[PDB]
Amino acid sequence: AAQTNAPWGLARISSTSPGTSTYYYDESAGQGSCVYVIDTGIEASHPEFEGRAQMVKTYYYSSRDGNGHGTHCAGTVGSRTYGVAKKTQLFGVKVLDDNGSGQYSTIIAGMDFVASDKNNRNCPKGVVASLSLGGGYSSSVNSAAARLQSSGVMVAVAAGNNNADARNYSPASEPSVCTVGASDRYDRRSSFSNYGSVLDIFGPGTDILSTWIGGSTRSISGTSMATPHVAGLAAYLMTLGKTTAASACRYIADTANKGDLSNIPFGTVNLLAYNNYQA
Ligand SMILES: [Mg+2]
Ligand code: NA
Ligand code: NA
């Protein structure tokens, strides 16, 4: 399948070169997989989700996304126009408030929730969790991410936007999850992206068009925008049977475009998520 005039990041993950605008992908499109977006919520009514999104848990008064961030990230996972895995099922877990902030104890609880809740859900091709969030180093946050991964979920987390080594941030610094840095449309490491030995992969993160609240769309930048490209890619690859939740991060690194990013510090991987789709 092919989506013409796609957002640059979708085109990028289906090309060996920057500058294209068609997203090429297998029509299965993540059907039968599930992605939990652990964030500010998801505006499930947005027409771009086509009824495939639903809130499953909130840690605040409402399940509504009063911010937009979670809706944007969910859109990069699985919206029709802006999503990597256009037929995945999206589940929203609101651990962040409407200002985009959250306490680590609540974020931990939401990870634990996903590890359990997946047993209520029918996700025959597997389960992914996208965590476009984090703060300073916390062993407890890292442990929660590790548990979620161990429970059988493909965990993708943001590297952070500190232009610093991700070792000092969580859940970025948890080794066992998939830590995602950000790139721009010219294959430079995004100016804000964290780096370091703990990164597993880069995805598109600068100027990413996706869904927003009020039934809208907008372009924003962050390792939060790179993370759902990887989460969506994992769901897509799991639906194709190419990999599993436990091995998807490694598979994505194995199959990535290698050596194509600039301003990658020595010791950080030079790997950009790639679907290797051959019609
Ligand atoms: Mg890792
Ligand atoms: Na996300
Ligand atoms: Na470089």
Q: Does an H or E element contain 150, and which?
A: helix 139-150
> What dihedral angle (degrees, nearest 10) is formed by the CA atoms of 85, 86, 89, 93?
70
Task: Please give the structure tokens belonging to residue 251.
Answer: 């598979």
3-state secondary structure of 105: helix
3-state class of 267 per DSSP? coil
Ligand with the closest atom to the CA of 249: 1
According to DSSP, the β-strands at 89-94 and 135-136 are unpaired
Report whether 33 contacts 84 (CB < 8 A).
no
Which residues keep their CB under 5 angstroms from ion ligand 1?
Answer: 200
Count CB atoms within 10 A of the CB of residue 54: 13
d(C-alpha 196, C-alpha 167), whole Å: 7
Documented resolution in Å: 1.1
Instruction: Indicate which technique resolved this structure.
Output: X-ray
Quick check: bond before 171 cis, omega within 30? yes
Structure tokens belonging to residue 237 = 């690859």
Ligand at shortest distance from the CA of 157:
2
CA of 82 to the centre of ligand 2 (A): 13
The CA dihedral of 77, 9, 189, 156, to the nearest 10 degrees, is 10
128 known member of a binding site: no
Concatenate the DSSP letters of all residues of 228-253 into one string. HHHHHHHHHHHHTTS--TTTHHHHHH
Q: How far is the CA of 226 from the centre of ligand 3 (A)?
A: 18
The token pair at 99 is: 């200002």
Please report which ligand is nearest the Cα atom of 132.
Answer: 2
Q: What span, in angstroms and rounded, lies between the C-alpha atoms of 189 and 38? A: 25
Distance of CA 80 to CAs 14, 142, 182, Å?
16, 32, 22
Residue 134, SS3 per DSSP? coil
- Ligand 2: centre distance to CA 267 (Å): 26
Antiparallel, parallel or unpaired: β 216-220 and 208-212? antiparallel
Q: How far is the CA of 27 from the centre of ligand 2 (A)?
A: 23
* Cα separation, 81 vs 97, whole angstroms: 26
Q: Please, are residues 228 and 74 in contact by the beta-carbon 8 Å criterion?
A: yes
Q: Which two tokens stand for residue 133?
A: 């969030």
Residue 260 marked as a ligand binder: yes
Taken in order 150, 92, 165, 141, is the CA torsion positive or negative? Answer: negative
Query: Residue 70 corresponds to which tokens in the numbers above?
Result: 């979670």
Residue 257 Cα to ligand 1 midpoint, Å, equals 17
DSSP structure string for 4-59: TT--HHHHHTT-SSSS---EE--TTTTTTEEEEEEES---TT-GGGTT-EEEEEES
CATH T-level topology, domain 8-255 = Rossmann fold (3.40.50)
Domain borders along the chain are: 8-255
User: Looking at the annotation, which residues are catalytic?
Assistant: 39, 69, 224
Yes or no: say if 117 and 83 are a contact pair by the CB < 8 Å rule. Answer: no
81 known member of a binding site: no
Q: Is 202 exposed, middle or buried (0-12, 13-18, 19+ CB in 10 A)?
A: buried
CB atoms under 10 Å from CB of 46, counted, come to 22
Whether residue 236 contacts residue 223, with contact meaning beta carbons closer than 8 Å, is answered with no
